[PDB]
Every structure is written in structure tokens, then in C-alpha cells.
Amino acid sequence: LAQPDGFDSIGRVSSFAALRNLKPKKSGQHVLLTSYYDGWAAENKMPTGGGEFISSIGTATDDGGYIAAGPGYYWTRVVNNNSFTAEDFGCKTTATPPPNFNVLPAELFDNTAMMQAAFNLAISKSFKLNLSTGTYYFESSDTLRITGPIHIEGRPGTVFYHNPSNKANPKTDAFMNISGCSAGRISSINCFSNSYLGKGINFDRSVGDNRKLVLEHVYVDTFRWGFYVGEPECINQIEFHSCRAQSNYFQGIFIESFKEGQEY
Amino acid sequence: LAQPDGFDSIGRVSSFAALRNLKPKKSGQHVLLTSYYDGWAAENKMPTGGGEFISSIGTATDDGGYIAAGPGYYWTRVVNNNSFTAEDFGCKTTATPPPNFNVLPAELFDNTAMMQAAFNLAISKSFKLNLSTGTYYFESSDTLRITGPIHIEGRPGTVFYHNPSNKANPKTDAFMNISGCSAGRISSINCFSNSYLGKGINFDRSVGDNRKLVLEHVYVDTFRWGFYVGEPECINQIEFHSCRAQSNYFQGIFIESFKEGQEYGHSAPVHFFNTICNGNGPTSFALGATYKTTKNEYIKVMDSVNDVGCQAYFQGLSNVQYIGGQLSGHGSPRNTSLATITQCNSFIIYGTDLEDINGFTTDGTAITADNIDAIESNYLKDISGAAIVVSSCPGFKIDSPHIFKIKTLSTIKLM
């Protein structure tokens, strides 16, 4: 142990799935999670979603990245500096494809269910979500929703790739939906779809007003619409500080409160 | 130790108080601190202020969260990424109370002495202080002082609750005091008191000038004044990027470099960006309200029955830009104006939302369409009677805003 490389003798858990099957001894046990998925050495990469966990004996709902529940026990992730990464929930990145039409990334892993769980934790626990560089692939029938104030800070090169397939009426469905995000912070996210279909980001009144919401370096490209607002009293004091809506089929920014027939 | 749970065999220190009594062996010992306070498992929560410490043999002053001093030794906390949390010094959060008057949080733990220690470390070591979500409770007699450049970053839901009790002259004392914070950054802090008493944030020259200080998403609500400045050459290049001053008894923004008798003094240039002042004036309820302190004492909120207020008050400034904000009185507060500009130079407005003024005069006479003819004759030289009253400001400019619901004599008054 006193050797210069004595830290390797300590045992760890290989993957997050093995953590669900780790029956603890008491309600104060500490373990080390090496990575969310095992086999990172053969893939010539480094662990991403590891950390430290503390055991319990009661009953809790399996979060996916925050709570690893089991039969009569569960583990809770120790969050540092009130911040966590999307890789802590099982999200995978890949190489960014060119902005050519109908060009898909090399690997196709749907991160919709994983990112939705990461968004729910950052809203319910008020933790800052850190996004890694690379391309997050999204091919699902559900919309990625932000239903509360959230702090998202991406890196240079963070890409959200939306595949309009699997969407019922894929011409007008929104990829991301923001509602009730009062005094939120979203930064450094480049969302494109390489298909002139769908809405990039849709601001709604499903939860509440997006009062004093701040967007910085948010890029929306290759969609039927970049920023879509079709409801009054939802973007009251919204702010765009350095944003880009580029190559979207009808409009890059579309804000229409009311239409002909309904009042002011 | 080769098992999947071999990391639990290593021993830890339970609390920060136990770390003070941990006599080491030499000046190179490493130890793991689980949490600042012990007993987090019974409280059904997680450890907050833990970390790793390194031993020494010399003598050092006990910081509270950075140095755990003992007899002939002390431990030093290892800081990562030049950042630390307020929980590392012993601060506790609680559930946020509603913004109702004289409503206190559920748990009452004073975090003033521990937050002051965290502020001192972030200023002396130039570390970034991270604030957790929840309500920090302050019920002390001293003012929370920032006496140097600091980087503070809060979370969505960080609340600084100030209790005006245990404070001599609780009607005019300041909760926070910022001085000498040059090129500092403060973000995402919501300070309210639920009592229309005290100053929210006070800027002064006790240490130096707050040159190029940047405030973002700083909310001040339920105080006698939201942002208070009563000294020249202290906010020379301050910036408000998206701030809110809401439901204060008198004003949301009060800047006055000098008063009568004193000669000229100013700060320049002041920058306001997307800042909103809403609902800041004496209201029907506030005038008749009485604040009950924790010591079972009653304080009358009103100074007089003819108390009148405003949303933003500016005096003795130069080159002030108010870019795309909002000045509005919601809840019908008694206001003489929405913005009062007095003895300024080059005050320019860029597309500010202005609405919902409750017209009153300085002495407390309600401006009504019935007596609109007696107001112009008897109150011509009064600093009131418009949504924006400009007095002795040469380079004024308003630049075509959208205005509505104006229940006073005019929209702009010049004198």
C-alpha cells in the first residue's frame, strides 16, 4: 500500500449496471465507480461517467445516473461543486458529421432517454449540467423537454444531432422544448439535423413563462425552423446574446403570438 | 481489498470538529473528511462540506472551513479547480419561504459568521465561491461585507434571506455591503427579507472603488431599498446585465452621490442592461403593516401616511445608459414617477418597457383626471407628475419606447 503505485490495490465497480447488483452491508458504505460502461480500454479511450457512491437500505426510484437502485437497497452518486456531466447518466458522444444534407453520424446511439433523465436531475436538484465535446445523437419519437430553470454549460464542439425519423408528423415536430425556465442559463450548444424538417427549439407555455431566460452561443441549423414561438406571454424577457440560426428551410427565427381570427 | 467494495475499508473523519482533535504524526499526512457535520444519514441527505486535508506541525489561524487548527498542528483543505462551496465552511440551507410579509423559513440557522469566512477566503486566495441551491438564513447584527475582488456563482434557486431583527436601527441598515470589488463577478443570487425594512445591497467607498464590477441575475426584493448608493466615485464602471429589484418599500434602485449643502460629486459611467424594477413603492398594505421581530417587538413600516416612492432614483451621475430594461409599478404602489433623474449628465434610454404608474405627488396628493387642472398650477415645480421626470439633466434621450397605462399628468416632464 505504501508503494508509489499502491492506489491500484483498492477495488472498484466496473460499470453502472454492476453497481445495481452490488448488495451493500450497511447504510454508509463508500464505493468507487470506474466508469458507466465497462470496456473502455479496448475502445482506446478513458472512463467518463464514474464517481463515488454511498449506499442505503430503503427504497428509491432508479434515476439512471444519480440513483442505482436494487432489491432492498440503492446507491446515491456524490455530486461535487453542484455540477455533473451528461456522461454520468449514460450518454455517448461520437464524431461530428459534415453539415451535408441527409448525412448521419457514424455511430447511431439514441441519447434521448438518457438526456431527459439528466435534464430532470438538473431541474429537480438545481445542479449545473456540463456537456462534453462531440455529437449527441437523438432519434426518438419524444421531444426533449426542459420544464424548469436549468443551468447548462457546453464545450466548444458540443453538437445535438436530431434525426427527424420516428416522429409522427416529422415535418413540424420540435426537437427541443423549453417551458418554465425562469432565469435559466443555456450556453454553447450547436443543434443541427441535416434535414430541412422539424423545429429546432420550441418555446412554449406548457409549464410557465420563460422569464429572463438567457441563451448564449446556441446554434440551430438545418431544420424547417430554428427558433419557434407560437404562443403569447412565453418569451417575455428572453435574451439572445450570441446566437446563430443558419440554413433552416423556412425561417431561422419565427415568433408569432397570435394568428388571424384570434384576438391580441 | 480486491473486491468491488474495497474502498469502504479506508477510514475517514466524521465531522469538521473531529478534524480539529485529530493529532497527526508528521507534516505530510493525508486524510479524508466525509462531511462538515456528522449525522447526515439520519437527516436523509448527503454529505456536503467534505474533502481532503493535508497535515502540518506549525501554527496557523483557524479559518473555519479552510484551516482546522489544533494544539501544535493544523490541517489545510485541498482546493480543486480554484473553487470551493459555502458548505465547506459550515453553511446550511433550508426550504425557501413564500414571498409573503413577515414569513420566516422553517429552520433558523444564522449563516452570517460562516459566510463572512467564506467571503474572506475567496478574496484573499482569489478562489471561486460556489453557492448551493436553497435558502441561506442571516439573523446577525453585522453586515455581510465584500471588501475585495471576488467571483461568486450561484445556482437557480439560491436565496439569501435576511432577518432585520437583532440589528440596531433595522429600518436603514444594509444586509450586504460591497466595496473595493474591482473586476468582480457576482451571479445568480436572490436576496429578499419579506420585511419592508433595511437596505438590500449597499455600495460605498469604505475600501475602494467598485471599478468594472459585473452583476448578473442578482435579485433584491422585500427591503426598504433594493440597491443603495450614497457615496460618489464608488460605482464608476458598474454593470447590471440582467437584474431585478422588486417590491421594495421606497425604491428598487437608489443612487444619490450627494445631497443639498454638499457640492458636486458623481460616478461615471454607469451601465444598465436588461434590468427590471417592478412594484417598488409604498402600497396600501405596506403603509398599514407592522413587522413583528423575533424578540416579540413591533416596528411600524411606514414613516408617514403620505409616504410615496418610485421604481428607480438617480442623482449625481454621468453617462448613464439604461438599455432595454423595464420600469413598471405592479400592485398599484404610490409612486411619484417610474424613474427620477436629478442633476445627471447624458442619461440615455434605449427602448425600455414603461407601464402601470400610480400617479402621486411628492406630498402625497393622488393625481386624478378630476383634479388634473389643479395639479399643473399648484405642482409645476414639484419633482413628480410624469412617468419619467427629468430635472437638471442636459443630455437626455428616450429613444421611442412603448408605454401604456399611465395614470399621471404627462409621460415625460422636463425642468
From TrEMBL, chain B:
Entire protein: shown range? 191 to 605 of 907
Q: Which UniProt keywords apply?
A: Virion
What does the entry give for GO biological process? biological process involved in interaction with host; viral life cycle
Write down what this protein is called.
Answer: Depolymerase
Where in or outside the cell it occurs: the entry states: Virion
**What GO CC annotations are associated with the protein?**
virion component
Source taxon at top rank = Viruses
